[PDB]
Amino acid sequence: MVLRRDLIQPRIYQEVIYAKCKETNCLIVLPTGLGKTLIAMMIAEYRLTKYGGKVLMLAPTKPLVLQHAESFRRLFNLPPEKIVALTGEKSPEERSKAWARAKVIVATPQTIENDLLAGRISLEDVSLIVFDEAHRAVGNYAYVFIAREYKRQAKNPLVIGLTASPGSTPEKIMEVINNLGIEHIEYRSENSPDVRPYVKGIRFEWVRVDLPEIYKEVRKLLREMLRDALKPLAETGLLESSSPDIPKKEVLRAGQIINEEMAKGNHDLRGLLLYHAMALKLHHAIELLETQGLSALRAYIKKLYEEAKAGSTKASKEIFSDKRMKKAISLLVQAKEIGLDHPKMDKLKEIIREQLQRKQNSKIIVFTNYRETAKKIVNELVKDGIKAKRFVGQASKQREQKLILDEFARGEFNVLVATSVGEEGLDVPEVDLVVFYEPVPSAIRSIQRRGRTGRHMPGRVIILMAKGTRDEAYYWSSR
Numbered sequence: 001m002v003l004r005r006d007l008i009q010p011r012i013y014q015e016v017i018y019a020k021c022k023e024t025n026c027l028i029v030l031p032t033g034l035g036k037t038l039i040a041m042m043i044a045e046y047r048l049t050k051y052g053g054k055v056l057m058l059a060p061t062k063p064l065v066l067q068h069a070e071s072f073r074r075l076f077n078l079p080p081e082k083i084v085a086l087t088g089e090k091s092p093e094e095r096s097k098a099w100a101r102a103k104v105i106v107a108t109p110q111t112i113e114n115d116l117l118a119g120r121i122s123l124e125d126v127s128l129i130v131f132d133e134a135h136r137a138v139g140n141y142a143y144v145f146i147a148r149e150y151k152r153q154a155k156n157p158l159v160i161g162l163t164a165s166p167g168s169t170p171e172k173i174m175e176v177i178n179n180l181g182i183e184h185i186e187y188r189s190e191n192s193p194d195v196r197p198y199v200k201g202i203r204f205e206w207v208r209v210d211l212p213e214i215y216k217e218v219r220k221l222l223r224e225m226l227r228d229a230l231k232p233l234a235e236t237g238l239l240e241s242s243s244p245d246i247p248k249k250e251v252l253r254a255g256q257i258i259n260e261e262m263a264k265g266n267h268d269l270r271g272l273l274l275y276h277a278m279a280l281k282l283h284h285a286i287e288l289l290e291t292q293g294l295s296a297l298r299a300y301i302k303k304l305y306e307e308a309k310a311g312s313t314k315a316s317k318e319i320f321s322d323k324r325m326k327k328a329i330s331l332l333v334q335a336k337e338i339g340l341d342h343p344k345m346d347k348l349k350e351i352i353r354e355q356l357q358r359k360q361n362s363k364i365i366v367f368t369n370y371r372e373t374a375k376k377i378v379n380e381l382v383k384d385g386i387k388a389k390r391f392v393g394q395a396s397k398q399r400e401q402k403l404i405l406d407e408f409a410r411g412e413f414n415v416l417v418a419t420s421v422g423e424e425g426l427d428v429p430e431v432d433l434v435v436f437y438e439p440v441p442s443a444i445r446s447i448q449r450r451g452r453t454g455r456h457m458p459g460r461v462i463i464l465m466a467k468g469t470r471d472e473a474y475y476w477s478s479r
Contacts, residue, residue, distance in 0.1 A: 002078070003041055003045035003076060003077070004077060008075060010035075011197075013195050014039050017188070018039050021043060021184070021186055023158070025158065025181050025183045025184070026184045026186055027166055027177070027180070028161070028163075028186050029163055029164070029186070029187045031164060031190055031449075033452030034188065034195065034198075036162040037068060037162065040162060043130075045076075047127040047128040047158060048103065048127065051156045052125045053103050053127070054104075054123075054126040055128045056104075056126050057072075057105070057130040058107060058108065060108070060133050062087045064132065065087055066085055066087065069083060072104055072106065078104065082104065083103070083104045083106075086098065086107035095115060099115075099121045109142030109143050112142070113146060116149055123149060123153060124155055127155075127158060129158070129160070131180065133163055134166065134176060135161075135163045137179050138176055147159065147179055147180050159182070161176070161182065199452055200452075201451075202448065202461070203460070204447075205460065205462045206462075208466075208467050209347045209464055210343065214294075215289075215294065215342070218328050218331050219286065221328045221331075222285050224324060225278075225324050225325065226244040226279060226283055226286065227244050229275050229278040230242035230243075230244070230251070230279050233275055238254035238276075239251065248283060251279050251283060254279075255273075257269075274314060274318070277314075277315035278315045281315055281316070284300065285297055288300050291369075291372075292376060293342030293376070294340060296372070298335075301325075301328075301329065304316050343466065345376075348366065348381075349380070352381070352435070355433060361411070363411075363428065363431045364414060364415050364416070364431070364432055365417075365418065365425050365426070365434040365458070366415060367420075367422070367436045368438060369420065369437075371396075373437060373438075374391075381415060381417070386414065386415060388413060388415040389413045389415070389417070390418070391417065391419075391422040391425060405425060409428045420441075423442060426443075426446060426456060426458065431458050432458070433458055434447075435462040436464060438465075439463055439465075439474050439475075447461060
């Protein structure tokens with residue numbers, strides 16, 4: 001038994017596909033998590049036992065090359081030194097030395113191209129090439145060249161391209177199909193009768209948090225001011241509408257547009273630069289209010305008040321002379337008076353409470369897009385009677401990661417609060433529940449994918465949303 005099929009329990013669709021693409025240049029299109037690489041290895045085994053003795057898998061990044069290389073070593077019953085990884089960091093000689101004895105080789109297209117031109121290696125004995133992320137086999141990419149070489153100098157050629165999508169454009173698809181000499185495409189959806197039996201229902205529980213009067217009001221005032229700040233920009237045509245709902249990106253555009261016009265020698269739309277600055281500030285204020293809460297807003301309004309007194313920023317001045325900003329500032333104090341910072345925190349505490357109550361042994365993960373929010377959540381939870389610990393990915397304020405993660409696993413603390421980077425915590429056994437402070441794309445994606453594999457999955461997951469705020473829109477927008 002060359003491939004340890006006994007350890008991977010190939011599924012029906014995996015089997016079927018392997019059988020068809022076994023002797024035809026194919027494109028295997030499956031949503032991530034369904035085993036494309038595994039199917040590849042199944043095919044790789046068929047080639048190594050019937051034809052020559054060289055299988056080559058290419059991958060975009062180096063971490064991907066290493067990863068695949070390891071999986072092959074784990075599932076293949078072949079001498080460990082015959083499974084080589086060419087990241088292109090070895091001595092130009094060793095690479096040729098490795099390629100020499102290798103029976104399976106995983107490398108980046110970059111390096112394989114070089115040594116291919118230089119004449120150090122020849123893909124004539126390669127009974128199979130697998131292009132991971134084959135869709136990037138367009139234009140200039142090293143894939144296209146390698147594909148061409150292989151196509152002409154290979155004894156028994158077989159091209160297998162793996163991808164979650166070959167392209168979005170007919171032209172784009174045609175380019176890769178032709179570049180890789182694709183004779184056939186095997187597609188599958190999470191719903192193919194072929195795959196369904198292997199896909200887990202997820203059930204994300206979307207819970208809508210209502211907004212307390214003060215929060216609601218402060219927000220309305222801030223929005224209304226933003227509207228007025230945008231009206232003039234819109235009436236000029238610098239943006240589609242003066243709606244406080246427009247994307248931040250659209251207002252930044254309105255700004256640089258005015259700049260590129262002064263660089264040309266216009267200077268008419270000069271006065272509008274004032275409103276653009278107020279917009280940016282008001283927009284940021286709303287952003288803090290929604291993303292973090294009243295306290296973050298208060299802090300910013302203050303730091304913004306120093307800019308007004310310093311007499312430097314005309315924008316900051318104008319914003320304070322507005323009766324609305326005034327009433328906002330009064331409510332903002334009225335808030336601290338009752339300890340109101342953000343509705344989600346209250347709801348978060350509540351659900352985490354009832355969870356630890358039904359099982360104080362609970363292991364729960366809280367996700368958030370922002371580090372600041374993560375920090376405020378940890379404190380607010382430890383401030384209550386809860387054992388919470390922050391989990392972020394070293395960039396500003398490494399290995400402790402593994403340490404803390406192990407603690408989470410053993411039962412040290414009950415709550416792991418992390419940003420996108422902490423999605424590896426989902427690989428910890430028996431994690432009872434994860435709750436998204438806001439929807440966090442990468443993590444929601446991770447969970448979605450795990451449902452396709454048999455990897456650890458949370459017992460239940462809750463997504464929180466602020467009634468009538470971007471949160472809601474994102475729920476819908478997502479169909």
